């Protein structure tokens with residue numbers, strides 16, 4: 001396991017340019033999205049939490065097809081506000097319930113250092 005904590009102040013630096021295998025070593029779920037919500041990276045911890053196959057979701061749109069329960073002001077709305085300003089950094093609890101047992105989580109979305117890239121981190125509560 002990579003020694004990185006959820007919510008760490010410099011998480012975007014420690015995860016900067018991490019390959020898919022390194023991301024698979026985290027204690028929490030980690031998704032990377034482009035500014036439209038298309039999935040660029042998706043780690044093993046997230047797949048174990050949600051049931052999605054980390055290999056199959058790459059290239060799908062998170063808000064339109066994988067996670068319609070997040071297509072709301074409280075998730076997607078906050079995401080796109082932070083994309084537009086270039087300073088996305090919000091941590092909030094949420095329930096994931098599309099074609100799955102409703103699963104309550106803490107979400108941390110934060111701008112990544114790479115261009116047109118935004119992290120969504122997820123742990124259970």
Ligand SMILES: *C(=O)/C=C/c1ccc(O)cc1
Pocket residue numbers: 031046050052066067068069070095096097098
């Ligand atoms: C609501 O539809 C949430 C779905 C979901 C959240 C997070 C994932 O990694 C996959 C699906």
